[PDB]
Structure formats: structure tokens, C-alpha cells
Amino acid sequence: MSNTLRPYLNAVRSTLTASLALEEFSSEIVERQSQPEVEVGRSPEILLKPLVVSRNEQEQCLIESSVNSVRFSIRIKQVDEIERILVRKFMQFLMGRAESFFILRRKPVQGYDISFLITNYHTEEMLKHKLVDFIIEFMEEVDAEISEMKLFLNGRARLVAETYLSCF
Amino acid sequence: ETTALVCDNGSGLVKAGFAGDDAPRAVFPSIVGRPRHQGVMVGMGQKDSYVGDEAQSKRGILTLKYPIEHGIITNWDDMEKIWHHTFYNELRVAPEEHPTLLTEAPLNPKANREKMTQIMFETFNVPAMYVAIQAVLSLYASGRTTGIVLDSGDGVTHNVPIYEGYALPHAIMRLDLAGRDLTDYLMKILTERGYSFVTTAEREIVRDIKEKLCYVALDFENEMATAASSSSLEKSYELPDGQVITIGNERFRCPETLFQPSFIGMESAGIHETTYNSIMKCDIDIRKDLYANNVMSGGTTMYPGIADRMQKEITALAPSTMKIKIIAPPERKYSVWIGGSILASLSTFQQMWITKQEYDEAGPSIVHRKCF
Amino acid sequence: LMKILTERGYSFVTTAEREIVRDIKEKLCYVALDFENEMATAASSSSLEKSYELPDGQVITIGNERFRCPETLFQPSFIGMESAGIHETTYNSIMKCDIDIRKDLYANNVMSGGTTMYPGIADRMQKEITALAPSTMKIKIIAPPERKYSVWIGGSILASLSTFQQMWITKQEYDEAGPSIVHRKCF
Amino acid sequence: MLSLDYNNIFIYELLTERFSSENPSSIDQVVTDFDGVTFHISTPEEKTKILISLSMKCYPELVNYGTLDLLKQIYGAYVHEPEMGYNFSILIDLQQLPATDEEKEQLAMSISMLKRNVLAAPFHRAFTKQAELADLARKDPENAPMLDKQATSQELMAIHYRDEETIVLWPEHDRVTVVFSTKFREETDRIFGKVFLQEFVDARRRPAIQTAPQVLFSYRDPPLEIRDIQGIQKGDDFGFVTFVLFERHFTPQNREDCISHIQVFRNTLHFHIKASKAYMHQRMRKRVADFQKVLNRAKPDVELERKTATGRSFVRA
Ligand SMILES: Nc1ncnc2c1ncn2[C@@H]1O[C@H](COP(=O)(O)OP(=O)(O)O)[C@@H](O)[C@H]1O
Ligand SMILES: [Mg+2]
């Protein structure tokens, strides 16, 4: 969790809080319309350069910013394939309820497992000095959950094995 | 690698930290407790299970179960929960980035060792791990190389004589009387004065009573005769309920169970006779040195005046021509940890790990043929 | 056997446990012809795990412990005791004996005592003794099924023998020299 | 549910309904079971006559093992010549059933329990052989090892009921050892089955359940006695769980339950893997809810006026 992820976590925090200087901006190709500019990528003069934060080859933090919208996709550790399946299913459930989260994408960008997307409106109404707090909190708690759920798998396997075998 | 993990997963208490440090970063009771009521409240963050210090603090509405019984883990689910707690909630370091050192009592079933190694390698994916005996750790901590070690803890008491750099596995004596049995006997003999302790919370309270009041006398008959004129021996304790209880001859009676195991109805030698037999089982040429080096270790050996009485009994048993000396450092409560850290911070120890690449190519039986 | 039963998980401490373990050694333990080969076989312990029904009704199962404890006789280093096995002990005893009867003693190897009732001890010890000794003479082992009480049988034969009555120790004959009268003529 | 059922529930319910009924009706339904076994129910000849058929890929091996006689003395005179496309057939007419209700219920249960009833022939044969060797060894203790070896050689029996499964069973003077050649395709199934099998081994070890038959599992290598047996690949991806059934585990009062249990083992393991998947689903959603709780910060307090129920404030003030 922490006491363990200081430099990576603080680098992500600083980069995210620096990249969240959004602004209301309409569409330069369609009139009377405004769209998240990071997702469309049609006007390159307002798209800041993509930025990547990493701690190890299996952990990355792609930070793509724009004038109004910021997309922030991360990779979390999957040491063994058990954690691979657990991470995939858990993060699918996480993104399946993006309606009540307001900063999630229903489908992550390829080569990743989750992609946040903070449009202007979220910074407009929701005070954003704890969106990053939620970000880092999730980035550590997710590994916590994966470990706990694999423990629960082992426990249930033990219980069912005992229940089956005792009734000879 | 900068530092290596090390965890003393003892039966009653668990000690964890980094190799080379001189202070336990994390010590919490090895307790996993589940609620036993309804919770008509709303919210409150209903947590399914509380482990460690949280369970010790909220024992009012919880039932506590020790995963390790008599040094053998019996609830692997609770053991995994405790290891997860140590890794994430208190030390909060990723297991996959730190080799770990574990401790297991001698003469335990091989199933315990194999299962522990497999769990650490697969469920936690540690880089490397090692399993060591308590007596070797005690010798490492004390700075000695020769001397029989008495390791009395919460779960089991064992003796492992070790000459200069060599251990005699055939002279290892293991006794299943320990702090938990002493606490149970104290609970049983506190009933004769009226006070009754039943639930696990009462068991922890009695453990605190034994912590703060129990001590070992010098001569049992003389101490009982003195207690007959019960004038200047009784003490008082304050329960959390606020009621004050008085303690008497049972203040020192229950520590004597170590020296007279017949008190709890078990036919075995005391912690002095077992040491004498363990020394006599060794070669004759090394007894003259093992007598001079008696090592006290573990939490149970923290009773006041236990060392003096044990020295008296061993001197009585042994011939008078050769002197008997017993040693007990004031920090012997964490002697096992100190030895473990000293061993883990040794350059010559770097090639004695068990790496994952070594483990997966030989199965979980590799621990038997490498660790010990 | 009590020491090595612990690693399987079982616990035996008291003297009642001592008698129980003695019964277990009575019924289950046997001796392995080749230690390494039988350990390799027990690695795949498909057919080397008998089950003993304890008096408490809870069964226990032992694998290589069946034959690991009887090999202490052949390998006394298991229990830390520094000595040769019984086979090499007999070989040394015969070698130190005078030469003219070594061949006779090779062909007469009597087995007696309760401990020698392990299934297959005779075959293994015969093999090992032949390996130790030169191959030019033949060696055989005598293992009567009655060897449990062979000592009594010999005592009875000696007592019933016709000329043994002069070898006794009469009370009057004991009276003169006191307790030490036995040493001068018993053996 | 924790334990899988031991027979086909549909057959049991259908038989009970048609026996307790007064007006039978023509039925033609083919029903599949676990492990590829298929059952067919039809009434071709008479409305009161019901024919039930059994389908199994390994049935000829059962015939080789001597299952026809066991089926005959199990099902009495009910035996009928097999139908096309099926292995074992039975024809039942409602006009000859016993009047007593308990006889009808036990007949329905027995017919519904046809799967293990036909699959248990090797187990019964192994038990008879075990009794024979037990009495022969009791005749002379010194004659044990050679007859044990010859029984391990000759009486070594085997069967292939799935293309990734195998039962290898053989008797002895005191035990009847059985080997399962488990293997899981559908990668995630094998992924969870690794943990399931590892935990299943440990179980027996625990002193809590020592009364159970001894288990022995070691992947990438088969036991000594079945490397030479045809059909056993040299540890490609197949595990090998081995149960050692002692005399106490098939006492004359516990043979049938043990047979059914050891038969249903693999299906229980599969179903419980699926149940573990569901357990993940529910826990994972249950506390991604907690993550949503953690997120629900960063929302300044707002007030909704009424939003009473199934409507919009139901009032202008
Ligand atoms: N000062 C003390 N006086 C009396 N008993 C003590 C004292 N300190 C610890 N104990 C007993 O020793 C036990 C500590 O066990 P511990 O030595 O941590 O076990 P392990 O060596 O297996 O980790 C406690 O349960 C407690 O009852
Ligand atoms: Mg300890």
C-alpha cells in the first residue's frame, strides 16, 4: 500500500494535479457543440503531449490531457495468472457501473485495464482536490483487494474439499 | 535488494519487521475474531472480521479464535488473514518485492512447514523465503555458539542443545505445556475464590492478570506455608468492569505448573527435569559446557525469579563438581526476532535462500531438504 | 518410532502412548530390503501406507515410517548413537574370532529374541553379511519361528538335562561364601 | 447446494408422477446427464408402457467388465432388449407395479439411479476380489507379498468414461486403491482446478479428518503401477488423484454410499469451481460498492425537495 509506494504514488499525484487545469471549450469543427477533446483528437493545437508514469515494467500511468478533458489509464500488477483473472473480472465490474462514478470509462484503452476520463464538468461542479485522493486510494486498495480475494479463493477451496471428503 | 522481511509468527504473539533493525515495527496478538450479534445500527462500516489489535480492542462484542494451537497452525484461513494483515495493514510493503524469513518450532509436523512454504510462494508470491528454528535464532541473538536453549512461549516449550556450530537433533526435547495452558490453569484456580471467567474476553483478562501479577517462588512448600499466614502476600487487580479482585497463593501456584506438570493432570517432567534429561542425552564431553550455558528465551520466561529457581533445581540435579550458570537477557522476549534479523543480515546467508525459480522446479518438498 | 511419528502429525507422550506405539510397531513395522530403493518406492507411496486402528477409534496412516524405524538397527546413526549396525557388528565379532572356525560360524547364524521378528530381517541381514564377507564361502541364517521364546526353550533343555543336577547351587553351598559364591562357578 | 445429487432428478420426478397418476400420457423426451451420459424416455407401444434407454460411450468396456449380470440381478425381470442407438433399455408397464407405496417409491429411485447402478460393476468386482485376497492372506500371513503383486499385475482394472478422465482400480489383501486421471480444459477451469486440487490434497492431512481414505496426488508423473497401462499419457497436463480405500471404508454397511461418492467426485469438483466463480462475482461487486462509497466524496451537499415515491413531489409546495 503506502510505506511502499511513496515515489510512484507521489509522482502520479503531482502529474494528475498539474494536468487538471481544464477549461470550457467548444468544438472547432462542429458548431454549437462541445466534446471531450482528448477522446476525439481532431484539433492537435489544444492537445498537450501524452505523459507516462511508471514504477516497474508492469505498472504504467498514461496521462493524456487536453483543453477540457483528461484521460488517465493505469496498469496494475498481475504477478501470477490468478491475479490476472481476478484483476480482469474485478476491473470489469468496476467499469460496469461507471454511471454512478462520473470519472470512469465503460471500456479501457487497449493494453490497459482501466481508463478514467475527467471531463470539464466534473471539475466544474465536483470539487477536484479529492478526485486525485480517490485515484491514489484506489491504486493501492486494488492490489489489497486482489490479495484478499485470492485468500478467499484458497479458503473456500479448503472448505469445499473438507466438506466433500469428510462424508465418506 | 535493500532489506529483507522477517516475521515471527508465534502462537500467541507475532513479531514482524525488517532485517537488521533492533525494534519490532509491528507486534499484535495473533487473534482473529468474528462478531456474535445483530447490529441494528445503520452504517458503522460493518467489517466481517477484525484481526490483531482491532480485535483486541473490540473484544467486547467479538469471539476470538487463535489460529495457531500448540505451535501447529489449525486455521489456515486465519493464518492467511494474519499474514495479509502483517503484509498490508501494518508493515504495508508489497510481498512480491521482499524476501521473507519465517520461524517454526522444532518437531512440528512436516505438513505445517510444507503448507506454509507453499502459501508464501504461491498466494503471496514472495521472491524468496526461509524457515528457521527458534533455538538457533536464540543463539544467534545471544552471540553465543554453544549452549542448550530453553524456549518457552505461548504455544510450546522446547529444548535444543547446540554445541559449537553443531546441533544434536536426537537430544531435542519438546514439551506441550506453555503460556496458554498456564492461563487456562489460572482461570481454573481463580474459580475457587469466587471469580469466574468464561468467555474469550475473560480469557484475555486472565492473561493480563498473569502478565501483571504472576511470579515464580523459590521453595514451593515454604511459600505455601508463608501464604497460610496470608498477611503480606496478597495483591489486588482492577478489572475493566471496575470491580477489584484479590489474588493469593494462586498468584505463584500457576507458574509452578511448569516445574510440576501434574498440576494440570499431565504425566511429564518439569521444565528443569526435561532440560537435565536433554543435556544428559548428549555426549559426555559437551555436558561440561552445556551446563555453563543455559539460555532462557521466549515470553513465558519473563516471570520474576524463574531463572533463580531453575538454576537452583538444575544445580541440585547436576553433580556439584561442575558449576551451573543460567543466562537471560532483559530483552529475551524478542530474542527469537533478534537472532532471525542477525541471520537474515549476513552475507554468507545470501546463498541459503530458496528462490521462486528454485521452488517451482522441485515442488514444496524442497523446504525439507534445504531449510532443515 | 515415537520420534518419527510426530512429523506425520500424530502426538504420543505418555506411557500409555508408549504401549500404543509398541503395539503399532508390533503390527505394522517391517524391514526394507534396500533402503534407497524402498525410499524411492515410498516417494510414490501407492502401496506402502497401512492404516492402524487406534483404541480411540481414530485411524492413523504411516508410510515410510513403517520401515524407517527398523533400519536403526542397521544404521544406528539415525538416533545419534555412534556405532556400527548389527550386521557389521556380527562381521567384526566373527573376524576377531580365531580363524579356524570362522567358516563354521559363517554357516551357523542363529536368530533369537523378540526384536528379530521383523518380517524379512533374515533376508536383508543375510544379503548384507554376504556382501561384507568374502564370496568364497557360503553363509546361511537360521530363523526358527519359535525364536520368541528360544531362550526359555534352551533353559528348559538345560534344566531337564541328566547331568545338570550337579551344576546347581545348594542353599548350604551358597551359605559359605555368601553372595559371591555364584561368580566362581556360574559362568 | 454443497453435495451433487446421486441420480437423475428428472427421471425420479417423472416416474413418481406417472406412478401416482391415474391417466397416463404419451411422452418422448431425451435427457442428458453429467459426463456425456444420455437418457431417452419414450412410450412407443402402449400409453401405459414406458421405455427408458441409457447411452454411454464406454459401455462395451463395462460389458467386458461383467456388468450385464449385475444389471440383471439388480433389475430383475424388467430387462428388455436394447433399443436402437442406446446401450441398456428397460420397459415398465404400470399394471404390474407393487400396490404398496414404498415399493413404488424405491423402484422409482432405483430406476432413476441407473447411472451409478451400471457404473458400479468394477467397484463390486474389486470388492469381491479384495474379500478373496483377504481370506487367502488370512489363511497364511507368509503368502502375502507375491499374491499382492500378482493382483496388482493381473487384476489391474481400468476404464475411460471421458476422453480426459480415467479410473484405474485394483484390489489387494487389505485395500482397493483407485487412481483418477483428472485434467481440465477451458483454461480458466484448469486455473481454478489447480488451487482446488491442492487444497483437496491438504484436507486429508489435517488430523481433523484422518478417518477419510488416504489421498495421493502428484501431477507430471503417474504412480508406479500405471505408467505401463495404456491410455495414461506421460504427464502431459494430467493430474493424478489417488484414493486408498482400506477395509473400514467399504464395510458391508457403507459400500453403496462410498461407491456413489467416489463416482460423483469429479462432477462435484467441477460444479464447485463454478460456485467459486459465482462467489467471486458476488464479493467483488459487494465491495466495489465500498469503492463507490469511497468515491462519493467530492460532491457538495445539495437538497432535493420531496421526491416522495414513484412520482415527482406530488404537490406544488
Ligand atoms: N512479563 C510476562 N510475564 C508473564 N507472562 C508473559 C510475560 N510476557 C509474555 N508472557 C506470556 O508469554 C506469551 C508470549 O508468547 P510468545 O513468546 O510471543 O510466543 P512465540 O514465542 O511463539 O512468539 C504470552 O501469551 C503471555 O501469556
Ligand atoms: Mg515462539
C touches A (3+ CB pairs < 8 Å)? no
Is the CB of residue C172 less than 8 Å away from at least one CB of chain B?
no
Q: At what angle do helices C86-96 and C121-132 cross, to 10 degrees?
A: 50
Strand partners, A60: A54
Q: CA A61 to CA A115: how far, in whole Å?
A: 10
> Do the chains contact at B267 and C9, CB–CB below 8 Å?
no
**CA atoms within 13 A of residue A71's CA, in its CB half-sphere:** 19
Nearest CB among A5, A143, A151 relative to B81 is that of: A151
Question: Are there at least 3 beta-carbon pairs closer than 8 Å between A and B?
Answer: yes
Gap from CA of D114 to ligand 2 centroid (Å):
57
A 67-86 residues inside an 8 A Cβ radius of B? 77, 79-80
Q: Does D138 touch chain C (CB under 8 A)?
A: no
Instruction: Report the residue of C26, C45, C47, C117 to disrupt the D interface, i.e. the one with the largest count of D CBs within 10 Å.
Output: C47
Per-residue cell: C12: 504420543
Q: How far apart are CA B315 and CA B28, in angstroms?
A: 37
Rounded Cα gap, residues D175 and D216, in angstroms:
15
Task: Answer yes or no: are the C-beta atoms of D53 and D15 closer than 8 Å.
Answer: no
Closest residue (by CA) to atom 22 of ligand 1? B10
Instruction: Say which amino acid occupies D315.
Output: V
Using the Cβ of C49 and the Cβ atoms of chain D, whether some distance falls under 8 Å is answered with yes
How, if at all, do strands B26-29 and D28-32 pair?
A: unpaired
Cell of D148: 499382492
Give the span between the Cα atoms of B57 and B51, in whole angstroms.
10
Handedness of CA B354, B356, B357, B363 (dihedral sign): positive
Residues B86, B9: Cα–Cα separation, whole Å: 10
Beta-bridge mates of residue B237: B245
Within 8 A of B111 by CB-CB distance, chain D residues are 202, 205-206
Q: Where are the domains of chain B?
A: 1-31+68-131+334-368, 32-65, 133-178+268-329, 179-264
Q: C110-143: string of b/e by CB count within 10 Å (b at 16+)?
A: eebeeebebeebbebbbebbbeebeeeeebebeb
Chain C residues in contact with B176 by the CB 8 A cut-off are 11, 13
Which residue has the CA at smallest separation from atom 21 of ligand 1?
B153
The rounded distance, in Å, linking the Cα atoms of B161 and B293 is 10
B1-31+68-131+334-368: CATH topology: Nucleotidyltransferase; domain 5 (3.30.420)
For the record, the C-alpha cell of B161 comes out as 542443545
DSSP class of residue D253 equals: T
Q: Burial level of C105, CB count in 10 A (0-12/13-18/19+)?
A: middle
Tell how far the Cα of B210 is from the centroid of ligand 1, in angstroms. Answer: 10
* Residue type present at position B39: G
Among C3, C7, C12, most B C-beta atoms within 10 A, so best to mutate, is C7
Atom of ligand 1 nearest to the CA of B214: 4
Chain B hits for D206, CB-CB cut-off 8 Å, are 111
Backbone angles phi, psi at B9, to 5 degrees: -75, 70
DSSP, residue by residue, D143-196: GHHHHHHHHHHHS-EEEEEETTEEEEEEE-SS-EEEEE-----STHHHHHHHHH
Q: How far is CA A58 from the centre of its chain?
A: 14
**B chain contacts of residue A154, beta-carbon cutoff 8 Å:** 76-77, 80, 119, 123
Rounded Cα–Cα distance for residues B122 and A82 (Å): 10
Angle at B260 between CA B259 and CA B261, to 5 degrees: 110
Provide Rg for chain B, Cα atoms: 22
C180 touches chain D (CB under 8 A): no
Give the alpha-carbon dihedral of B289, B292, B293, B299, to 10 degrees: 150
Q: What is the helix (H) or strand (E) element at residue A117, kind and residue range?
A: strand A114-118
CA–CA distance, D136 with A38 (Å, rounded to integer): 85
The CATH H-level (homologous superfamily) assignment of domain C1-79 is ATPase, substrate binding domain, subdomain 4 (3.90.640.10)
Specify whether the CB–CB gap between C41 and C48 falls below 8 A. yes
- Which residue, B49, B53, B46, B45, is CA-closest to B16? B53
According to CATH, the topology of domain B32-65 is Actin; Chain A, domain 2 (2.30.36)
* Beta-carbon count within 10 A of B19 CB: 22
Indicate whether residue B299 lines ligand 1 (CB < 6 A).
yes
Radius of gyration of chain C (CA): 22
- Cell 508408549, residue located: C18
Residue carrying the nine cell digits 477419510: D212
Cβ pairs C/D, distance under 8 A: 38
Which of B320, C3, C56, B307 lies closest to D211, judged by CA?
C56
Chain C residues with CB under 8 Å of B111 CB are 9
Compare all CA atoms of chain D with the CA of C62 and give the residue at the minimum distance.
Answer: D214
Q: Alpha helix (H) ranges present in A42-130? A: 81-96, 120-125
Evaluate whether B6 touches B20 at the Cβ level (below 8 Å): no
Report whether residue B342 contacts ligand 1, using a CB cutoff of 6 Å. Answer: no
Q: Which of B151, B158, B176, B211, when mutated, tests ligand 1's pocket best, judged by the most ligand atoms within 8 Å of its CB?
A: B211
Tell me the ligand closest to B16's alpha carbon.
Answer: 1
| C-alpha of residue B299 to centroid of ligand 2, in Å | 8
Integer Cα distance of D255 and D249 in angstroms: 8
What is the whole-number distance in angstroms between the Cα of residue B298 and the centre of ligand 1?
7
Question: In this complex, is the C-beta atom of D291 within 8 Å of any C-beta atom belonging to chain A?
Answer: yes
Q: How was this structure determined?
A: cryo-EM
> Are residues D177 and C47, on separate chains, in Cβ contact within 8 Å?
yes
Cell digits of residue B190: 481463580
Q: Would you say A140 and A1 are in contact if contact means Cβ atoms under 8 Å apart?
A: yes
Beta bridge partners of B151: B158, B297
Q: Whose CA is nearest to atom 25 of ligand 1?
A: B154
Q: Is B179 in the pocket of ligand 1 (CB under 6 A)?
A: yes
- Separation of alpha carbons B159 and B157, rounded Å: 7
CB A120 within 8 A of CB A24: yes
How many angstroms separate the CA of residue D271 from the nearest CA in chain B? 22
Which atom of ligand 1 is the closest one to the Cα of B298? 17
- Say how far residue C71 (Cα) sits from the centre of its chain: 11
Resolution in angstroms comes to 3.5
Q: How far is CA A73 from CA A16, A64, A90, A164, in A?
A: 11, 9, 16, 44
User: Which grid coordinates are listed for A18?
Assistant: 498539474
| Kind and range of the H or E run holding C42 | helix C35-43
Q: Which domain holds residue A61?
A: 1-168
Query: Which burial class, exposed, middle or buried, applies to C62 when counting CB atoms under 10 A from its CB (0-12, 13-18, 19+)?
Result: buried
CA of B259 to the centre of ligand 1 (A): 17
3-state secondary structure chain B: CCCCEEEEECCCEEEEEECCCCCCCEEEECCEEEECCCCCCCCCCCCCCEECHHHHHCHHHEEEECCEECCEECCHHHHHHHHHHHHHHHCCCCHHHCCEEEECCCCCCHHHHHHHHHHHHHCCCCCEEEEECHHHHHHHHHCCCCCEEEEECCCCEEEECEECCEECHHHCEEECCCHHHHHHHHHHHCHHHCCCCCCHHHHHHHHHHHHHHCCCCCCHHHHHHHHHCCCCCCEEEECCCCCEEEECCHHHHHHHHCCCHHHHCCCCCCCCHHHHHHHHCCCHHHHHHHCCCEEEECCHHHCCCHHHHHHHHHHHHCCCCCCCCEECCCCHHHHHHHHHHHHHCCHHHHHHCEEHHHHCCCCCCHHHHHCC
Q: In chain D, which residues have their Cβ closer than 8 Å to the Cβ of A84?
A: none
Give the gap in angstroms from C-alpha C104 to the nearest C-alpha of chain D: 30
Q: Do B88 and A147 touch (CB under 8 A)?
A: yes
Min Cα distance B96 → chain C (Å) is: 30
Of the candidates D217, D210, D160, which has an alpha carbon nearest to the alpha carbon of residue D35? D160
Query: CB–CB of C80 and B170 under 8 A?
Result: yes
Q: What does the alpha-carbon distance between residue D317 and residue D314 come to, in Å, rounded to a whole number?
A: 9
Reading phi first (left if > 0) and then psi (alpha if -120 to 50, else beta), residue B94 is in beta
Say how many domains are in chain A: 1
Q: CB of A128 within 8 A of CB of A122?
A: yes
SS3 D317: coil
Q: Rounded distance, CA B159 to CA B106, Å?
A: 9
What CATH number has the domain spanning B179-264?
3.90.640.10
Q: Comparing C-alpha atoms, which of B259, B328, B309, B317 is closest to residue B287?
A: B317
B1-31+68-131+334-368 against B32-65: fold identical = no
Question: Ligand 1 test: best mutation among B237, B271, B300, most atoms within 8 Å of CB?
Answer: B300
Q: Which residue's alpha carbon is nearest to atom 1 within ligand 1?
A: B302
The correct CATH number of B133-178+268-329 out of 3.40.50.300, 2.30.42.10, 3.30.420.40, 3.40.50.10190 is: 3.30.420.40
CA distance A26 to chain B (A): 43
Cell of D274: 463454478
Question: Which helix (H) or strand (E) covers residue C97, if one does?
Answer: none
Cβ-proximal residues to A104 (8 Å cutoff; 6+ apart), any chain: A94, A95, A98, A114, A116, A117
C176 CA: distance to closest CA in chain D (Å): 55
Mutation choice for C interface testing from D150, D170, D177, D210 by most C CBs within 10 A: D210
CB contact under 8 A, A126 and D203: no
How far apart are the CA of B105 and the centre of ligand 2, in A? 7
Q: DSSP code of D227?
A: S
| Cα A82 off chain centre by | 20
All three cell numbers of B291: 551446563
Q: D with A: 3 or more CB pairs under 8 Å?
A: yes
Ligand 1: does its nearest atom lie under 6 Å from the Cβ of B29? no
The amino acid at residue B19 is A
Q: Are A132 and A17 in contact (CB under 8 A)?
A: yes
Residues ≥6 apart with Cβ < 8 Å to D111: D11, D15, D52, D90, D92
Rounded distance between C-alpha atoms, residue C20 and residue C55, angstroms: 8
